Design a protein around this ligand. Sequence first.
Ligand SMILES: [Ca+2]
Ligand SMILES: [Ca+2]
Ligand code: NI
Ligand code: NI
Ligand code: NI
Ligand code: NI
Ligand code: NI
Ligand code: NI
Lengths: 215, 211
Amino acid sequence: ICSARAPAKYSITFTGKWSQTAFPKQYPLFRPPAQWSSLLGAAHSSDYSMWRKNQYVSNGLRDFAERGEAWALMKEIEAAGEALQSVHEVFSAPAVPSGTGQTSAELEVQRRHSLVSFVVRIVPSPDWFVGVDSLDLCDGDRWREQAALDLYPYDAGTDSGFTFSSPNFATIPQDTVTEITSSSPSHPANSFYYPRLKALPPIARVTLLRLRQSP
Amino acid sequence: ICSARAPAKYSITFTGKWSQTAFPKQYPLFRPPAQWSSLLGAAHSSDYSMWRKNQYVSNGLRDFAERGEAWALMKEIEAAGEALQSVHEVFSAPAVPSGTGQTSAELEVQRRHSLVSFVVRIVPSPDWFVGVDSLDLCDGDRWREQAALDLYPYDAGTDSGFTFSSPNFATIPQDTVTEITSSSPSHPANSFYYPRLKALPPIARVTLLRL
Ligand SMILES: [Ca+2]
Ligand SMILES: [Ca+2]
Ligand code: NI
Ligand code: NI
Ligand code: NI
Ligand code: NI
Ligand code: NI
Ligand code: NI
């Protein structure tokens, strides 16, 4: 029930927090070193879903989650806008070439498309990523000034590899998106299995800040 | 002088042409495979320069050209826009995980900022990249409907490695940006050294279309 009179510009700042200190298990040091893919996202309405927990990822997202290929996903978003007018604009931020680091982009939301979603692939990984699914920046007739979120690893459900550098192994039948925790999947061989922790620490963080580039 | 009355939106499509067919010499196939970094650029005026042949790269651009680290470069572009009125907006496109893939983004230019510049790092490489320096999309009171350019490799002048997969080696003292051609540099193993060719084929292509 958003009633925001005018659109609003926001800066989205992604912070990678995948350090060896925070996540020592099987930490990728070379060929390739721990890093992140480009950040791809969009401002949209509830009629469009880039991804959702417990839902199958689109072929476009599968390609992005497994190889950082963003073209098919970009075409899907473009097609969604043409078919259901569910997308205001697509945005992206440069990839972070290391475990820790930052990257940013500017986006615009409007009452009709006040939701923001984005995905960033964990490199290297079978099909693991982080992101936000339909964060609503509108709160009635006003735009939220700021949104700070902790990000946790997700499994696309397309590749069954157990570790960051595991060779490709298609998941059949295909599974749905699942959140990866310190206890699930449960096995010493799994990259994020830390039985001594109550929960995994955030692997990344993101901040949406309403910009003041005009009155 | 640009007298265009209103701003204009453009799509920018980057198409890689770094194929094993066109560039058979030491083509990167493993750890990591030939590919492109994210594309980073900006709509700006002549008071801002992202890069230019025979000029030293900024600290931000050194980081980007050598490791694909774009934070500092993005901060430089943003600052120029906020403090010097020289940048209208920064734009970026997703990285291309193959030498022949494609990526795109949308950008806006206006009479006060009708130029477009961008850089894309060649991966892997010592400090090589492709890009455009100050392409003017305005033509008097009209906006150009389209502009397409073939792109060739450039050297940032900060790392002296001779090949795509060469380990880091600082260029001391630092050199300025130079174009890489089929005849120069001419180190036996220089990745783009093809003594028999009149010139290198384009390694990429960029197309700007008014929306
Ligand atoms: Ca999986
Ligand atoms: Ca060099
Ligand atoms: Ni925009
Ligand atoms: Ni805008
Ligand atoms: Ni814009
Ligand atoms: Ni704008
Ligand atoms: Ni815009
Ligand atoms: Ni290097």
